[PDB]
From a paper:
The human Parkinson disease protein 7 (PARK7) was first identified as a mitogen-dependent oncogene (DJ-1) in association with the Ras-related transduction pathway and later discovered to be involved in Parkinson’s disease as a causative autosomal gene. It is a small multifunctional protein (20 kDa) containing 189 amino acids, which participates in transcriptional regulation and mitochondrial regulation, and acts as a molecular chaperone, oxidative stress sensor, and glyoxalase. The deletion and missense mutations in the PARK7 gene, affecting its stability and function, are associated with Parkinson’s disease. The upregulation of PARK7 is involved with various types of cancer, and the high serum level of PARK7 is positively correlated with tumorigenesis, metastasis, and prognosis. The multifunctional human Parkinson’s disease protein 7 (PARK7/DJ1) is an attractive therapeutic target due to its link with early-onset Parkinson’s disease, upregulation in various cancers, and contribution to chemoresistance. Therefore, finding compounds specifically binding to active site Cys106 that can serve as tools to differentiate scaffolding and enzymatic function of PARK7 contributing to disease pathogenesis or as therapeutic drugs is currently emerging.
Residue numbers in the entry: 2 to 189
Write the structure that this text describes.
Amino acid sequence: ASKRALVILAKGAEEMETVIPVDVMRRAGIKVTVAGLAGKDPVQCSRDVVICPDASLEDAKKEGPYDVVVLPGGNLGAQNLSESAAVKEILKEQENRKGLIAAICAGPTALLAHEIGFGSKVTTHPLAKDKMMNGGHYTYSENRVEKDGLILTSRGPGTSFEFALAIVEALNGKEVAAQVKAPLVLKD
Ligand SMILES: *C(=N)N1CC[C@H](C(=O)Nc2nc3c(s2)CN(C(=O)CN[NH2+]N)CC3)C1
């Protein structure tokens, strides 16, 4: 059976941090559901790219569980994820079932808001570090991608391919990740 990913898309999401993981995971044969936090209507991203979700989060929640739940960043997008009781319930269920949660740039601040993965080693964008580290609920990392068990974090648009390929490796293994990486023309 193909692995499955849920990507939660909120208004103000960083569109690169959304699209790069969706595209890379789909290249790996993962069945990705781009789920709109606000419903199936189009979502205006941080730099005004408008993405049409595959489903509402309400409907996508019904079709779990998922092998990974992915939280893009964006200042407003991560704020919206952080304020959502629906996101809180999905992340708590994913943590409880020992499923992977992956968040990039400002996205990890939604882990803090929902009390997910406390005591984990995490990274964030530098500009989100102080927010993430308020209260000392995590240990901080400067690694471009940090994987501490089932909590996978990363730093920014420029780490999005590394982040996505780490998700692919976690779900589908090293060889699939190498296959997907091969034609991307990534540096090293
Ligand atoms: C990646 N998706 N990024 C990196 C730059 C963008 C971002 O994180 N911008 C931020 N603006 C604020 C953040 S993060 C956190 N912040 C505070 O530290 C306020 N007090 N806090 N505990 C507010 C503004 C998106």
